[PDB]
């Protein structure tokens, strides 16, 4: 699965001087492998998104169509995947 675009979200857009929500083009090619990522907080079931966007060539994301955080009880959850807007849906399977 080829990643040309990701959902973009930045909760810290005001401080970071970015836009809040949009589509982020991942400028890939045949020799430039790209991924999407999602990062969030989980306060006893309540999900607060921190950031969503494009992610550079990372072996942790290879051939992952689903965005899954597999680390046990992190402070800030992270996942990465391949395919357009794959970071819109994310989950936690420790």
């Amino acid at each position, epitope marked *: 699965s080829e990643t040309q675009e990701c959902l973009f979200f930045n909760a*810290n857009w005001e401080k*970071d001087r970015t836009n809040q929500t949009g589509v982020e083009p991942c400028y890939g090619d045949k*020799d430039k492998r790209r991924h999407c990522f999602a990062t969030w907080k989980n306060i006893s079931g309540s999900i607060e998104i*921190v950031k969503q966007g*494009c992610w550079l060539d990372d*072996i942790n994301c290879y051939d992952r169509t689903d965005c899954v955080e597999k680390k046990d009880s992190p402070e800030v959850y992270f996942c990465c995947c391949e395919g357009n807007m794959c970071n819109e849906k994310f989950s936690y399977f420790p």
Partner: antibody, heavy 114, light 111 residues
Framework: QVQLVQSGAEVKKPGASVKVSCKAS????????INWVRQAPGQGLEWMGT????????SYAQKFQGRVTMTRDTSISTAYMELSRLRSDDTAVYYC????????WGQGTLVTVS | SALTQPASVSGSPGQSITISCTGT?????????VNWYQQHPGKAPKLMIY???KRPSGVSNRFSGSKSGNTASLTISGLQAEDEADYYC???????????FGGGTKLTVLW
């Protein structure tokens, strides 16, 4: 182009701390990891640890656990590596590098421990 | 776990030469994540080869990478004076993966 611009050389005494800075430009800072490596005079490259700038999560090499702190400020695309309880054999050039492949390196920061 | 490299190699101009990087079955033998860095004296390392055999843009095609068992190898063809430097092997560092560099190999071009 892609650039990792580091802070200037530092001279420290044993027992003190050093904080090295690494500014990223020519790419989106939050699109990849920042790795830290050091090299003692005339010796080999040694991995220190990695920071994930979007989660703020870190992994440190066993050798530096308890002494190293890696942080970042996404608003200014800067990663920081602080090394505490300095000893003379901490005299080395400290590098930051982009991503899991270390595809781009900073110019290095010489930290001398006298 | 440690990556073992020979301390040094010497070649004549125009020849081919190999630099090896040996790990174990659970690291080099299991993953395609071995990278090669060139470092000139007083300069920062430069990525030559990543993911065993992938070459970044702007890197001469005289540089090639391969693996067999627990050993990854960097091959330099058409050996030039400018190739004289230190070569380090390393593994991907991020997420689940912890970094490790080989001891480095000093390459000498014999005149």
């Amino acid at each position: 182009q892609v650039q990792l611009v580091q802070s200037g050389a530092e001279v420290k005494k044993p027992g003190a701390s050093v904080k090295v800075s690494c500014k990223a430009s020519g790419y989106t800072f939050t699109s990849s990891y920042i790795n830290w490596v050091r090299q003692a005079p005339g010796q080999g490259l040694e991995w220190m640890g990695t920071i994930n700038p979007v989660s703020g999560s870190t992994s440190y090499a066993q050798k530096f656990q308890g002494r190293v702190t890696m942080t970042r400020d996404t608003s200014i695309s800067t990663a920081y590596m602080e090394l505490s309880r300095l000893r003379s054999d901490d005299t080395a050039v400290y590098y930051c590098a982009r991503g899991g492949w270390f595809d781009y390196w900073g110019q290095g920061t010489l930290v001398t421990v006298s | 776990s440690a990556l073992t490299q020979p301390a040094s190699v010497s070649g004549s101009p125009g020849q081919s030469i190999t630099i090896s990087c040996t790990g174990t079955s659970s690291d080099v033998g299991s993953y395609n994540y071995v990278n090669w860095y060139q470092q000139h004296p007083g300069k920062a390392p430069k990525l030559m080869i990543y993911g065993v055999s992938k070459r970044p843009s702007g890197v001469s095609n005289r540089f090639s990478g391969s693996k067999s068992g627990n050993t990854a190898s960097l091959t330099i063809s058409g050996l030039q004076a400018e190739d004289e430097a230190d070569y380090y092997c390393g593994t991907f560092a991020g997420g689940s993966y912890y970094g490790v560099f080989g001891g480095g190999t000093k390459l000498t071009v014999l005149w």
